[PDB]
Amino acid sequence: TPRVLIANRGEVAVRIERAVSALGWQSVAVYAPDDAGSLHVRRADEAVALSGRGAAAYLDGAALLRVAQEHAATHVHPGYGFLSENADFARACAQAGLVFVGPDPDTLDLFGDKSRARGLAQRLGVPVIPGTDGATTLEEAAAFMQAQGGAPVMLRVVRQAGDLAAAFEQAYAERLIERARHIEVQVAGDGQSVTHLWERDCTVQRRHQKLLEFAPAPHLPQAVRTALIGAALQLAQEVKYRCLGTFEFLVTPGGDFYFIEANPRLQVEHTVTEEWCGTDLVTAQLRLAAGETLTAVGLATQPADAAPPPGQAVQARVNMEVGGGQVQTFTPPGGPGVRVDTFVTTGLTPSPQYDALLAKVVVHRRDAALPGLLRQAATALSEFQIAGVSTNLAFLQALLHHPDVQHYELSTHWLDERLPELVTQAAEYD
């Protein structure tokens, strides 16, 4: 029976402890003292204190390897963030007789390298953003910028050939892709075959942090869907992918797409796909790591144009925001069509060592119309009673009532452009 070391904390470590229990396996959690009131502590079958201090304590690869040895772990689940994309760490697990819950280290190395992941995309016919592939010839950043014809470029954002030398100095030539949606494809594999759980749309972002994530992508034509999934399946198949991974794209209004990132791990938003599709991704992920087939783990091996599930779901990230305080009242929404993934209980004082996430609220219904889903999600959020720390709950409600979200007339820059209006609107919910 596996003994799974959860090399992570917070809402993901809780998540993992619940999939481990569902399998009849055992879990070993780790914690830093400033994290000790976290639900992931109590929820493990056994929790092991780290001698490190902060976020640092969870990133000490050799410390985690000591924990694993000392407590007879067989498997290491890195969750997301921390060491989930660290190929050396995966190697070191492998070396110590531990199975890393993730693809092979060579695949970690590949998808973690901008230049190798691009070249792979290019060799398979998968479009990528126009850019400088490596280094940056740099007086010429101007030359590529001149080749973009007046269109803006990201290093900072450079809009004029004149502004380049000065903006550049502040601190690698990519075309700025404007008016696009962020659409990503969930993959799974067993090392022989690959499959998919369709898509998610994570377009509503605040300085590149995702706030609202939708499965399906609203108002997406099937032809674009089947193309996105086909691209993702080609990437995964080419590396003989094992376990879970997500392939991220920017998609223009007319359905052009650009491969932007391969995340070779579980993601925060895996929850929306779970509730839309009626599937447990994390038990599947664990079983795939332990050597079962897609068919044995209960994932259908399906083509890119497979008809998507009916219904719809959205996840909202509830954040503390910044600030401090001890959590005094904390009573997340529940009941039909709502699911909440957290680590927070009453009397917790969150530590600034860790990100601002307090809870993820997933809302799901079985009809197709977006406005009805947004109304349901706003209601569920309005039932979230938090006292003692400040949150984004009003801001989430302003998002969910905004017309442009109601028609999904959105791009990845939508929110940053409208931040003052949205902050005004949020005071009606405060």
Place this chain on the structure above:
Amino acid sequence: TPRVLIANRGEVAVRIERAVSALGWQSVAVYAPDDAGSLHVRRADEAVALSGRGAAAYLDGAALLRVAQEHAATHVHPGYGFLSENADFARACAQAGLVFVGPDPDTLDLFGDKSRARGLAQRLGVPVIPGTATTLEEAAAFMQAQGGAPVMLKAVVRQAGDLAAAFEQLYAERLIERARHIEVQVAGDGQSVTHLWERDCTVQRRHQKLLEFAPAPHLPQAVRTALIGAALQLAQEVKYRCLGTFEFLVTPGGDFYFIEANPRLQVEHTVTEEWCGTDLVTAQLRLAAGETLTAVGLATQPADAAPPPGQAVQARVNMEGQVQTFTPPGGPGVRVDTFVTTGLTPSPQYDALLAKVVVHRRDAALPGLLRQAATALSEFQIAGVSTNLAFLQALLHHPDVQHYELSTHWLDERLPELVTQAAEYD
């Protein structure tokens, strides 16, 4: 846009507010003053105080009709309990231009009368429990013809000589031993009928359900198909509209007997919802407003339709003070339906139900569901009132429940054992 008067309170009234909302419709809630801390007050689009007191307040038919008139309601949802089986009330709604969310009043009468419903089952070939107008010389004659098997009087006698002494404290029927409680969920649009398969509610404390399973664990398909086909006969026969449940006792070899037709939503609709991936209450409302099964998203399907994969169970968390801490479980595979929030003081005018906890998984093996259920309940933080949480845990860990080697008399027989056991979980 309909405005639905919710003639009820507590968790079901919150349930119905949620379904009305999903539809883009409007709710009007009602409450007695001592119930004003309930979630169903604030969760409704508009809430109205009753001038009655406690439970009585909610049973005042004419008062409710006055609320409906004054607030321009169009539909009345009676939930379950209270006036949900009251045919006179249903008639009165219709008279006042309010659509009663449930079947026609002639069906409420029929299914509310033991002798008419027995009679219907009999005409249709559906077995009913042997039984009896009393006369002690009808009771003792029946007891004899049962050749020594026990018998119940209602509305428990083991020996002929024990009868008359026992009698006075009425009709008589065979006591059905070693049976499971299996019930079939029906839905109709008045033209056609369909089902969402079965539930098992065998674990009972003096006839009060505590754990309710969908599907019925370790049920042969042949027995499923028969149960469903019997229920579908009963419902097609009355051209049933809306939701209704047909309950049976089932022997270990698969004999079954019709025991009750509940022509309404039930408390344990929630387990079927999670197992099947269906919203029964929005269907029910749409069905009451005259859409077809098809139009409301319900497959019209035969008795032998293959059941959905996975499994689900509901546990009823009961107060059995002021609620100082209330933090229900959550996360993947759990759903909690309540009305309670921190600082509510429960009124002893209303039943002991605090929360329904529904746990759902997509594999087949029962012990793993039980384990999941137990772990969810261990996360339920309640302070200020006493609950049945530890008791519920002892149920979930018991080997007989793990093997589903149960009957409707199982818990009652083992109550001291289980009460001992529960002590380990607090």
